[PDB]
Design a binder for this molecule. Structure first.
Ligand SMILES: O=C(O)[C@H]1O[C@@H](O[C@H]2[C@H](O)[C@H](O)[C@@H](O)O[C@@H]2C(=O)O)[C@@H](O)[C@@H](O)[C@@H]1O
Length: 226
């Protein structure tokens, strides 16, 4: 008794260009499955037309992974001259107790390293400044460097918020409601890697492994250019 996101034409294209992973890396639904009305407690359309992702547990996810319409996985040159752009209108609800960080958008390499995570965090300390209840950008410093550069993007609101990720020419930019919040961050450390976008709910370091993270997307698209 869950309504499928495929019933809304605003999602047809991105679902054609995605596969759904849940609760870890295994695909539960490919593009054709998604287009054919795939729906579950962790992936469904709300009555006000949000695509909602929900998942409990440490490092568990309900997440769309960028695909080509051919069925090939997206694997674009992370630092190439072609622009790759992800856009999403996301409402981040107040998270359940014990949910401490939820990753909502990513640029991931074709191996084991997230180039970029955009996440909600309960608390973060960056160079001696603690922020509470914010949306954060985390860019990994390298494949062999587990550390990352972190940038607060936005004070958390439940209001629908426009996020835009633009990747081109070894630089990455993020806009939030039209305002640039990360301006041409360097990602040259992923020269020679291939990349793709992800979107959904990825539950990072919960303190209650039974609590549900929950993220809602009113619009989602990923594109190439030139
Ligand atoms: O030591 C850390 O906790 C390390 O985590 C990093 O984010 C990771 C996420 O929590 C997820 O596990 C997944 O997405 O992998 C990420 C990663 O290893 O890059 C960063 O937040 C990093 O700053 C932090 O030290």
């Amino acid at each position: 008794f869950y309504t499928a996101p495929s019933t809304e034409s605003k999602f047809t294209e991105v679902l054609s260009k995605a596969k759904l992973q849940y609760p870890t890396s295994t695909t539960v639904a490919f593009a054709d499955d998604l287009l054919d009305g795939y729906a579950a407690s962790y992936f469904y359309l709300t009555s006000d037309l949000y695509m909602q992702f929900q998942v409990a547990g440490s490092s568990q996810r309900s997440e769309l992974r960028e695909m080509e319409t051919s069925g090939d996985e997206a694997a674009w040159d992370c630092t190439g001259s072609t622009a790759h752009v992800a856009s999403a209108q996301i409402a981040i609800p107040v998270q359940e107790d014990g949910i401490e960080e939820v990753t909502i958008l990513q640029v991931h390499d074709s191996d084991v390293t997230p180039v970029l995570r955009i996440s909600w965090v309960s608390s973060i300390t960056i160079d001696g400044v603690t922020s509470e209840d914010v949306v954060l950008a985390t860019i990994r410093n390298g494949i062999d460097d587990s550390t990352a550069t972190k940038t607060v993007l936005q004070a958390h609101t439940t209001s629908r918020t426009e996020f835009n990720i633009n990747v081109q020419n070894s630089k990455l930019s993020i806009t939030v409601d039209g305002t640039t919040e990360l301006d041409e961050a360097d990602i040259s450390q992923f020269d020679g890697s291939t990349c793709y976008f992800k979107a959904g709910a990825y539950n990072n370091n919960p303190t209650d492994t039974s609590a549900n993270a929950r993220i809602k997307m009113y619009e989602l698209e990923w594109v190439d250019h030139h």
